[PDB]
Short mmCIF file of all heavy atoms in Angstrom, two decimals:
data_model
loop_
_atom_site.label_atom_id
_atom_site.label_comp_id
_atom_site.label_asym_id
_atom_site.label_seq_id
_atom_site.Cartn_x
_atom_site.Cartn_y
_atom_site.Cartn_z
N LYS A 13 -0.60 8.19 14.19
CA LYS A 13 -1.25 8.88 15.31
C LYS A 13 -2.21 7.95 16.15
O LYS A 13 -2.14 7.69 17.34
CB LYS A 13 -1.83 10.07 14.96
CG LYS A 13 -2.55 10.83 16.19
CD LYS A 13 -2.97 12.21 15.76
CE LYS A 13 -3.45 12.87 16.98
NZ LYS A 13 -3.93 14.29 16.66
N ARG A 14 -3.07 7.22 15.35
CA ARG A 14 -3.89 6.27 16.02
C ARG A 14 -3.22 5.18 16.75
O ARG A 14 -3.67 4.81 17.76
CB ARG A 14 -4.82 5.59 14.82
CG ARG A 14 -6.12 5.02 15.43
CD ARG A 14 -6.36 3.76 14.91
NE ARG A 14 -5.92 3.46 13.55
CZ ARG A 14 -5.56 2.36 13.03
NH1 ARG A 14 -5.75 1.21 13.63
NH2 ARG A 14 -5.09 2.39 11.84
N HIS A 15 -2.14 4.65 16.25
CA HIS A 15 -1.23 3.61 16.85
C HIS A 15 -0.29 4.16 17.87
O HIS A 15 0.47 3.28 18.45
CB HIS A 15 -0.54 2.97 15.77
CG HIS A 15 -1.21 2.01 14.97
ND1 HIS A 15 -1.62 1.95 13.69
CD2 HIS A 15 -1.81 0.73 15.42
CE1 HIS A 15 -2.16 0.91 13.26
NE2 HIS A 15 -2.35 0.14 14.32
N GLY A 16 -0.38 5.46 18.28
CA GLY A 16 0.29 5.98 19.42
C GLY A 16 1.78 6.43 19.13
O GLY A 16 2.53 6.36 20.15
N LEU A 17 2.23 6.57 17.83
CA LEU A 17 3.43 7.19 17.66
C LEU A 17 3.69 8.60 17.93
O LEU A 17 4.83 9.03 18.09
CB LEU A 17 3.99 6.92 16.20
CG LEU A 17 4.33 5.47 15.91
CD1 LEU A 17 4.70 5.49 14.46
CD2 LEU A 17 5.56 4.98 16.83
N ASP A 18 2.58 9.47 17.94
CA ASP A 18 2.82 10.84 18.16
C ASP A 18 3.40 11.03 19.62
O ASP A 18 2.64 10.71 20.60
CB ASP A 18 1.56 11.72 17.97
CG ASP A 18 1.77 13.26 17.96
OD1 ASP A 18 2.87 13.82 17.92
OD2 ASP A 18 0.66 13.94 18.14
N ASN A 19 4.59 11.62 19.65
CA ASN A 19 5.27 11.82 20.97
C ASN A 19 5.89 10.64 21.54
O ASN A 19 6.17 10.62 22.66
CB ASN A 19 4.41 12.70 21.80
CG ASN A 19 3.76 13.84 21.14
OD1 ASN A 19 4.51 14.67 20.51
ND2 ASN A 19 2.42 14.01 21.19
N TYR A 20 5.91 9.40 20.88
CA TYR A 20 6.51 8.21 21.42
C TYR A 20 7.92 8.41 21.67
O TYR A 20 8.63 8.81 20.68
CB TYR A 20 6.03 6.98 20.48
CG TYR A 20 6.38 5.67 21.27
CD1 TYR A 20 5.44 5.10 22.04
CD2 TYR A 20 7.67 5.09 21.17
CE1 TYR A 20 5.68 3.90 22.72
CE2 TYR A 20 7.99 3.94 21.85
CZ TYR A 20 6.98 3.28 22.56
OH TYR A 20 7.35 2.17 23.29
N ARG A 21 8.38 8.11 22.94
CA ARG A 21 9.81 8.42 23.20
C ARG A 21 10.16 9.92 22.90
O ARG A 21 11.40 10.10 22.70
CB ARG A 21 10.82 7.40 22.65
CG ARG A 21 10.73 6.03 23.29
CD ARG A 21 11.07 5.92 24.71
NE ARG A 21 12.50 6.28 24.81
CZ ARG A 21 13.44 5.52 25.54
NH1 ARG A 21 13.26 4.29 25.94
NH2 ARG A 21 14.70 5.98 25.45
N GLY A 22 9.19 10.77 23.02
CA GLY A 22 9.39 12.10 22.78
C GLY A 22 9.48 12.58 21.28
O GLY A 22 9.90 13.80 21.04
N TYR A 23 9.26 11.74 20.36
CA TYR A 23 9.29 12.18 18.96
C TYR A 23 7.97 12.55 18.35
O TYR A 23 7.02 11.62 18.24
CB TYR A 23 10.06 11.00 18.11
CG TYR A 23 11.42 10.82 18.46
CD1 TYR A 23 11.90 10.07 19.41
CD2 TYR A 23 12.40 11.57 17.69
CE1 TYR A 23 13.18 9.84 19.71
CE2 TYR A 23 13.76 11.45 17.99
CZ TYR A 23 14.14 10.54 19.09
OH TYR A 23 15.48 10.55 19.24
N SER A 24 7.77 13.68 17.90
CA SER A 24 6.50 14.24 17.42
C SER A 24 6.15 13.48 16.15
O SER A 24 7.00 12.94 15.43
CB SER A 24 6.51 15.74 17.16
OG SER A 24 7.43 16.03 16.01
N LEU A 25 4.84 13.35 15.81
CA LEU A 25 4.34 12.79 14.60
C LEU A 25 5.01 13.22 13.32
O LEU A 25 5.31 12.27 12.55
CB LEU A 25 2.84 13.13 14.52
CG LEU A 25 2.04 12.35 13.45
CD1 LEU A 25 2.22 10.80 13.59
CD2 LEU A 25 0.66 12.78 13.44
N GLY A 26 5.52 14.36 13.21
CA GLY A 26 6.14 14.78 11.98
C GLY A 26 7.47 14.03 11.79
O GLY A 26 7.90 13.87 10.65
N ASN A 27 8.14 13.82 12.88
CA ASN A 27 9.40 12.95 12.77
C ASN A 27 9.12 11.58 12.06
O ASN A 27 9.93 11.14 11.29
CB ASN A 27 10.01 12.82 14.10
CG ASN A 27 10.84 13.92 14.58
OD1 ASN A 27 11.85 14.24 14.12
ND2 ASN A 27 10.19 14.77 15.45
N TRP A 28 8.06 10.94 12.54
CA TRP A 28 7.67 9.63 12.06
C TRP A 28 7.27 9.71 10.64
O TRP A 28 7.61 8.81 9.82
CB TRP A 28 6.74 9.10 13.04
CG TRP A 28 7.07 8.78 14.41
CD1 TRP A 28 6.86 9.50 15.47
CD2 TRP A 28 8.03 7.73 14.76
NE1 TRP A 28 7.42 9.01 16.54
CE2 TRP A 28 8.11 7.91 16.18
CE3 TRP A 28 8.65 6.66 14.12
CZ2 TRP A 28 8.96 7.10 17.00
CZ3 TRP A 28 9.39 5.90 14.98
CH2 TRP A 28 9.58 6.02 16.24
#
Side-chain angles (χ1 to χ4, degrees):
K13 178 170 187 180
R14 201 228 327 153
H15 279 113
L17 283 177
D18 187 15
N19 314 309
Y20 191 92
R21 288 295 296 238
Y23 291 91
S24 69
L25 189 57
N27 281 284
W28 294 106

